[PDB]
Design an enzyme around this catalytic site. Sequence first.
Site, PDB file in Angstrom:
ATOM      1  N   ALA A  30       0.842  -1.220   0.000  1.00 15.86           N
ATOM      2  CA  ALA A  30       0.000   0.000   0.000  1.00 15.86           C
ATOM      3  C   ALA A  30       0.873   1.266   0.000  1.00 15.86           C
ATOM      4  O   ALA A  30       0.287   2.346  -0.172  1.00 15.86           O
ATOM      5  CB  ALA A  30      -0.950  -0.021   1.171  1.00 15.86           C
ATOM      6  N   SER A  33       4.550   0.707  -5.583  1.00 12.95           N
ATOM      7  CA  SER A  33       4.724  -0.340  -6.621  1.00 12.95           C
ATOM      8  C   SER A  33       6.228  -0.538  -6.852  1.00 12.95           C
ATOM      9  O   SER A  33       6.920   0.477  -6.826  1.00 12.95           O
ATOM     10  CB  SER A  33       4.070   0.085  -7.912  1.00 12.95           C
ATOM     11  N   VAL A  34       6.680  -1.768  -7.118  1.00 14.11           N
ATOM     12  CA  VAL A  34       8.116  -2.120  -7.362  1.00 14.11           C
ATOM     13  C   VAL A  34       8.260  -2.800  -8.736  1.00 14.11           C
ATOM     14  O   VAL A  34       7.516  -3.750  -9.014  1.00 14.11           O
ATOM     15  CB  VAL A  34       8.710  -2.991  -6.245  1.00 14.11           C
ATOM     16  N   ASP A 164      14.072  -2.970   4.990  1.00 12.53           N
ATOM     17  CA  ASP A 164      12.664  -2.691   5.386  1.00 12.53           C
ATOM     18  C   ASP A 164      12.585  -2.244   6.857  1.00 12.53           C
ATOM     19  O   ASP A 164      11.892  -2.882   7.679  1.00 12.53           O
ATOM     20  CB  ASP A 164      11.730  -3.881   5.195  1.00 12.53           C
TER      21      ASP A 164
HETATM   22 MG    MG Z   1       9.516  -6.710   4.467  1.00 16.42          MG
END
Ligand code: MG
EC number: 2.7.11.24
Length: 348
Positions: A30, A33-34, A164
């Site tokens: 959300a 986009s990758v 991340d």
């Molecule tokens: Mg992750």
Amino acid sequence: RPTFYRQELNKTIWEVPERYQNLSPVGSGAYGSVCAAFDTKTGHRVAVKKLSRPFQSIIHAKRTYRELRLLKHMKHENVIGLLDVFTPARSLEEFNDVYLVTHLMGADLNNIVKCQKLTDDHVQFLIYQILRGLKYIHSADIIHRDLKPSNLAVNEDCELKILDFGLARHTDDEMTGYVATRWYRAPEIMLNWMHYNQTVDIWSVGCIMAELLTGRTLFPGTDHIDQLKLILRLVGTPGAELLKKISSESARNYIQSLAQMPKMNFANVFIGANPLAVDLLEKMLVLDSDKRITAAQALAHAYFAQYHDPDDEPVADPYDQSFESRDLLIDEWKSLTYDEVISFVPPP
Ligand SMILES: [Mg+2]
Ligand SMILES: C/C(=N\Cc1cccnc1)c1ccc(Cl)cc1
Ligand SMILES: [Cl-]
Ligand SMILES: [Cl-]
Ligand SMILES: [Cl-]
Ligand SMILES: [Cl-]
Ligand SMILES: [Cl-]
């Protein structure tokens, strides 16, 4: 300014410098986009992330600024770095879109724990690298807050990067029930016991290390309360000293409603493990966060004797996070972000 070209990839306009070729969709949470791409300037395969609605609310604009500041700072072999950041806008007045470029990661730690056979030597090297990266992150007073196997990239040579970082993203729905998003979290953050600090990340390393040794999740709770009962059966119920540090009266009353239990014998839980691995787990998985081993202390533990090099365990440059307490408008956060995009200098 490079030349940019446009294309539509799954309902989305991508406008990117000519250096990035053969774009192909890989994912979309959300937050954006990758696409995978080939970077003709460096010869690397890269991930290109297009942020979604980066400036849609004060909360969203500040999160965009926070992510770009963090990624621009992180320069360490065991932490994800920023290869590039760009916008097709030619001025602040037409600025709407942000793209972030990193090395394309193949396998995560979940793609080796579940489907492979790890020796004690593999566990020493993998956990060494996580702690080397954490020494660097913690030296900048950054807390990761979301360490788990899916946030650890690993190559065929067993070389590891942390990715991340927690941008304070996770929702109440995401942390509910039988979910990996909660199984690695320290009990003081899972149950909001007190103001947490960087020690939360060492609890997560203990949970990861246990799972590499056994091949099984250490605390696979069906909900917050089930998970707390699994944790207290291993480490013991809290003593008077930790109960005094829990700020919620209801949280203290609830703990006191449980029958007391002693810490278990870790050599009888981690049957056949290296005794030095058992010792290090007993030093990470301590309920009172004040008493846990730090990253810098853990690197000097005898378990890592074949890898530890105190002249090759670097710390970070100082990191100014004063913006976190600052009250600004959407367009002010947007201007700060624009300045950070145009000042970017790529790595060597
Ligand atoms: Mg992750
Ligand atoms: C890649 C690697 N070692 C490289 C390396 C050389 C010298 C010093 N430190 C690290 C490695 C692979 C598998 C296992 Cl199980 C353990 C290590
Ligand atoms: Cl280009
Ligand atoms: Cl990197
Ligand atoms: Cl734009
Ligand atoms: Cl995971
Ligand atoms: Cl800074």
